[PDB]
Design a binder for these strands. Structure first.
Lengths: 62, 134, 210, 49, 49, 149
RNA sequence: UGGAGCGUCAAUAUUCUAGUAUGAGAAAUUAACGAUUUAAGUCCUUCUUAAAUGAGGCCAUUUACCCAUAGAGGGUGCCAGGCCCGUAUAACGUUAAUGAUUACUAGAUGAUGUUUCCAAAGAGUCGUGUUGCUUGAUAGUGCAGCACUAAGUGGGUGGUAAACUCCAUCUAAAACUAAAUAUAACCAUGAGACCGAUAGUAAACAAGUACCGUGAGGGAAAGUUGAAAAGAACUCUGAAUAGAGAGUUAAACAGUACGUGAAACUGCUUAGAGGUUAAGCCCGAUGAACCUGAAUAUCCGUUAUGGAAAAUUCAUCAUUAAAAUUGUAAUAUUUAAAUAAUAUUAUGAGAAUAGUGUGCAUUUUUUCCAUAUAAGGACAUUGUAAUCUAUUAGCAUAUACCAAA
RNA sequence: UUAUUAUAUGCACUUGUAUGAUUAACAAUGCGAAAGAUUCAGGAUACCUUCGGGACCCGUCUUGAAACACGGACCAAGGAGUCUAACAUAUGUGCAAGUUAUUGGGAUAUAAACCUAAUAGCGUAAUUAACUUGACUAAUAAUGGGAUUAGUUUUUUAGCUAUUUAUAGCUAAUUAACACAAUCCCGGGGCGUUCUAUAUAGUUAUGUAUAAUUAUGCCUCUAACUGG
RNA sequence: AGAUCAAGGUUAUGAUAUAAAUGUCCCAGUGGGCCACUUUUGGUAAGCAGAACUGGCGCUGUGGGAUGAACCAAACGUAAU
RNA sequence: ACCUAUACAUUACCGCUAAAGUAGAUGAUUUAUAUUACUUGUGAUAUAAAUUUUGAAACUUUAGUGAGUAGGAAGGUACAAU
RNA sequence: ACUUGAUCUCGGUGUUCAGUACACACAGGGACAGCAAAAGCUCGGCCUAUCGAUCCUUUUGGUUUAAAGAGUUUUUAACAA
């Protein structure tokens, strides 16, 4: 504040706001292929939100 | 840091002399260097060296003992005490405040300062008045 | 449950506010132990506070080719190759334990130096006080020499970070070391069929004679 | 939960804080890696500002 | 942000001895932030223990 | 444990319903106590918001040990906080006293992947595995890898 | 987690070990516990006027009466370190507990490498089938009843069954051990973000008692006169407990619901009133009745002018004593230098107080007294008079427009 | 020619026009009277007294309650949104490719705090059912390019105020850069399923050629790698 | 069809903007309704049922047809005119 | 010709929404006067006098505007112990 | 007359609506073809009906990995229609 209150030769850098990984829970209606949006997992592996709806043979592909 | 506004937001509400009384929006404190009791950011306990106090008398009723600011020669953390030096005007009724207005050359506090004096000598006048009525 | 939020996986069915211990005696469970250990270490000697020798190295699986757990084994078959003397070392205090059959020669060696790391600073207090056969020293008595009773008993403290700022520097850098991990690892998928390639090769020419 | 009691130090005590929180140029000593923390406003005057 | 910035504090004996020759510096913690959001709070939510 | 003037229901008394309705109000469970019936009548708020459920993706991995898939993964782009940070400054003089030696098993990192895009320096590096997109780019960069013991 | 013996390899031995007398140590010490000390005002005056701990004070030593290694508490006629036990370091004392030696009793020479001779090992159980509870355990976890019925380089075990090749690691059906772990019990012990007699254990007390059910068992209600019992003598009246006097106490407006005494009911006296919306209110007044809020140095002035008093860093006042402040100059702490910043060092100006001084009260200074222009009020409620934005009612000076003549 | 209007009023002064939500001169009525205490307005404080209009008597389910719908005799004390469990989001506070003691000991006064080591949670780097494999052609790239762009830089233009006519300010334009953030498309890449390019030569090494695991040559039977 | 130069008026209907522009909590509720005009089925029909398009009632007092949730005026800060 | 509404209009006022202004006071500011630079006349100097404070979470100022159960957030007060 | 497009394959799109899932139609891209001389037409009935999600049982499947020490061989286990 002592130097350049005018802002002559001054740069202004603001970071990203889809940056945080907790901010991809939006906005789901899975029928579209614009679904793309990270469901709330329990934890990775198998038998975790991966049989009925996602893949082919267990009812339907999303 | 020994900084004037750092004397203020930390003593904005957490003061231990500042008793507000449920009603008057947020005023009152009894700090010894208050002199006008709200908080300007200057009417208060030590602002770092624009301090002012007008304390009567202590010897009734002549003197008006007044401190001043203990400036740049002193840090002013405790000193071989130098923060106060207690000049006392006396021997006048309506002349000596001009000596008091001449006493000072950091001129923002001034109008309030003698505004104590124009009633505090009135607070310690009234013995040759108010009397007999026989 | 109303919305896109979190399959609720919580196991409080068994009317699980029944039998719950409250952990409200954490710190008095520190000032019993720390009060009794300094009663369990005032008792013995200027002998240290644990204090056997605890030699063992090298934690089991691919999670650890690095660390080394603090010594419950002590390998009876190491001992005769290192100047002991089993039951004499037991009342010394070794934690001598008669059941571990340590398999590696340098792990045999690893406690061997660790044995000889001790047994020399071990000050040999006399039994008959003629002190003709003890036989390291008796003039290094602990009032004269040590009387230390220090706790920690170090386990070499797991040194390397490092980084090794070392020139090598190669000449045979035309040698693709990655393909070893692809040839030989596919070779493990063939060792059954290669020995079965070996039975169709080494037994095919015997059908020619009849 | 209020600042400021009237505090009285001694000389052997007062020459340990430099150990206990190092300086603006270094880390500290008696704690591993506890650096001296930061200000978010490094001149804090307003009248002389 | 100056390293010492107030580097004169004297040491006194019981008769308050208003000058002594050893004048140690100020250990650069009286420039640290004085912050009443983390002393309002982390006091009383650690008082509770 | 709350500062309860903030907590929603110390200004709600008195409204004369307190926050949960005045027609079909707060009856101890309407829902089905839990997750019923994800196939049955809570269908719509379980697909959407939670597909892939209910079923069997298949490999009955009998008693996984989570050690055989340990492989902690480091990337080639870091690589020089791995070495000393100022130690990179003396490698750009130029002095070709290096490739340096970069152990990974002593670090706590196992398989060198290849996000990377390293500098031009040669490096002698030791990993527990390889990655093909990295190791060719290392081999253009004058350094090569050798598998750790 | 295994053998013994022989030779061989080495060390070696009046020895040491453990037990129980033993006194370490001229009982020296660690404690365990009771134990035992009080450290220092009950100081001089007010209130109490029912009681002082609260109230006033108390040479210095930088303002302590006094102590503090004791200032946590509870008894005390109110809030107490010094009134009292206590609590503070500790001493006193008893019991163990640390055994130097002495005795008796009991045993012991190795480990050490080598190969000779013998290396013997748990029998209705393993395990398979199969039924039935049960498991994280799924062609099986163990535990069981039934049928089976084992081998000796074997038996299990290696989380997918089955042989078949091996490998690794352990050796079934025999048996014991202080610990670090659990504690609404029982026994002595302290502790705080707990309740304050419709709370807290079912009960603060003669709560698992009064009490009902025959039974199993169900279980409530009820704590708190004042500092002291000083509990109301005696007189009068009735046949009495009583009731009036007389008392007692600071209190009886504290007398066995014995502190505080509400709320609903209302008994009483005074005040009003009335055949009404059935009682109620709400809106604005309404007598009655007590109440509330009421005041200050000019029109055409915060003017002219004359009277006194005290005084004086102020005069046109001089010096001197300061301490500062501001603003320079220098030095010292700086992240190589400057700067910034404190600390001391001096200059600078002016102000600034304490003290003296033409006249120092000569025409000054500071407090009271005076007339003069509208004039002693300067304020509140009121009647005007006009102004202003809205706004009604009541007359209109001259136009201009077609046609209608 | 005839009408017309404003411009050609400085200098002081004036209780004086108008202007800062443009209200105010006058007059009357009265002493804040030692204590005492009259006067003028107001004042259902919560009654009572006197009249004018209003007016169903309170919860609650329901389209609807004054309900000829249920609950309410009156009152004092007690009573109903809490506990933890893990999550999500919003948000405060430190820190940062790091973060975390809070299972532990030790320092030392006590349930506090202090100090602390290996781990180990969680992120780092994804997955396919798994075995494998593993994230932009490069010593670099940022939803890789595009348009939407604040802001800064810059081209020159006039321009204004200061103007020294420099130096700047503020215009609008204009030149270029970067394009922040943020949506919208285009990419490329890890991974998988699909054909395909292999007609495959190639490729490297076992092999192979010789020297003696060891050296070099090469064919490449063998592997493996490479194609969109 | 794409990138990139060349020329280009004053941007191209009216009237406004009480401000426009979006991502989370899927945020508490609520998922039983009623009526008049026209338009209108079911029934002979009804203060019944059954609806499409509006306005209103529930949520709403209000001045007016004495009265009356909807009728017709108007949609409710405290005050004088 | 009159008649009445909590509607319409204007003056005050309340809260709410929106917009806008204010911090070198060891200054700013007039009022006079001594002077002066003098530029006719505008300015600087000096004297004398007086006005000049706030949780910038303040303060000034401006317009518009106000029904409400089911329900959500906004500051405000009781009764607690730490 | 002559032939099997009532085909393999990849993902989007139509009406059901929360712009979900099933289903059914529709336009492609790639293939393999079938008739017709060609251009073309054909991814089933001329279009509005002629129909189903996990768990398994079960085929068809690469000639496919998993059985967690190492083979070989059978079994199951998995992915895909």
């Amino acid at each position: 504040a002592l130097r350049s209150p005018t802002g002559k030769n001054t740069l202004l850098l603001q970071g990203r706001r889809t940056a945080r990984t907790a901010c991809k829970h939006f906005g789901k209606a899975p029928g579209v292929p614009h679904s793309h949006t990270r469901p709330y997992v329990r934890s990775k592996g198998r038998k975790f939100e991966r049989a009925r709806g996602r893949r082919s043979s267990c009812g339907y592909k999303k | 840091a020994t900084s004037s506004h750092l004397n203020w937001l930390i003593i904005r509400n957490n003061n231990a002399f500042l008793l507000k009384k449920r009603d008057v929006k947020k005023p009152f404190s009894t700090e010894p260097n208050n002199l006008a009791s709200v908080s300007s950011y200057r009417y208060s306990g030590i602002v770092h060296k624009k301090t002012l106090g007008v304390v009567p008398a202590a010897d009734k009723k002549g003197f008006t003992a007044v401190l001043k600011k203990g400036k740049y020669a002193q840090r002013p953390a405790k000193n071989t005490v130098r923060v106060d030096f207690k000049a006392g005007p006396r021997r006048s009724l309506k002349k000596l405040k001009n000596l008091l207005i001449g006493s000072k050359y950091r001129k923002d506090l001034t109008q309030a300062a003698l505004r104590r004096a124009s009633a505090v000598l009135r607070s310690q006048k009234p013995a040759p008045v108010k009397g007999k009525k026989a | 449950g109303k919305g896109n939020n979190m399959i609720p996986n919580q196991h409080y069915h068994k009317w699980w506010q029944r039998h719950v211990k409250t952990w409200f005696n954490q710190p008095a469970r520190k000032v019993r132990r720390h009060a009794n250990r300094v009663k369990k270490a005032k008792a013995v000697f200027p002998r240290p506070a644990s204090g056997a020798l605890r030699p063992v190295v090298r934690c089991p699986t691919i999670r650890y080719h690095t660390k080394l757990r603090a010594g419950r084994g002590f390998t009876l078959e190491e001992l005769k190759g290192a100047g002991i003397g089993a039951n004499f070392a037991k009342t010394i205090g070794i934690a001598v334990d008669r059941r571990r059959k340590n398999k590696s020669l340098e792990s045999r060696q690893r406690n061997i130096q660790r044995l000889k790391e001790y047994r020399s600073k071990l000050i040999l207090f006399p039994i008959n006080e003629k002190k003709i056969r003890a036989g390291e020293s008796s003039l290094e008595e602990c009032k004269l020499a040590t009387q230390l009773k220090g706790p920690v008993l170090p386990i070499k403290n797991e040194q390397p970070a490092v980084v090794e700022f070392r020139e090598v520097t190669k000449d045979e850098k035309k040698f693709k070391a990655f393909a070893t991990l692809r040839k030989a690892r596919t070779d493990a998928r063939l060792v059954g069929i290669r020995a079965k390639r070996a039975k169709e090769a080494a037994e095919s020419e015997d059908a020619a004679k009849g | 939960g209020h600042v400021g009691r009237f505090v009285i130090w001694t000389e052997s005590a007062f020459a340990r804080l430099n150990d206990l929180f190092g300086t603006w140029k270094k880390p500290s000593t008696l704690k591993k890696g506890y650096n001296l923390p930061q200000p978010k406003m490094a001149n804090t005057d307003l009248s002389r500002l | 942000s100056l390293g010492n910035a107030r580097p004169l504090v004297s040491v006194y004996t019981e008769k308050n001895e208003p000058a002594k020759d050893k004048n140690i510096c100020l250990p650069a913690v009286f420039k640290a932030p004085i912050r009443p959001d983390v002393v309002n709070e982390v006091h009383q939510l650690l008082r509770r223990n | 444990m709350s500062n309860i003037k903030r907590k929603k229901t110390r200004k709600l008394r008195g409204h004369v319903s307190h926050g949960h309705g005045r027609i079909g109000k707060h009856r101890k469970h309407p829902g089905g106590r839990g997750n019923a019936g994800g196939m049955h009548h809570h269908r719509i708020n379980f697909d959407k918001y939670h597909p892939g459920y209910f079923g069997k993706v298949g490999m009955r991995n009998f008693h996984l040990r989570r050690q055989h898939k340990f492989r902690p993964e480091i990337n080639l782009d870091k690589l020089w906080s791995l070495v000393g940070a100022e130690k990179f400054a003396e490698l750009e003089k130029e002095k070709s006293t290096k490739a340096p030696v970069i152990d990974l098993v002593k670090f706590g990192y196992y398989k060198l992947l290849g996000r990377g895009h390293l500098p031009a320096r040669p490096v002698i590096v030791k990993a527990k595995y390889f990655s093909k997109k990295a190791e060719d780019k290392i081999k253009k960069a004058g350094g090569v890898c050798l598998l750790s013991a």
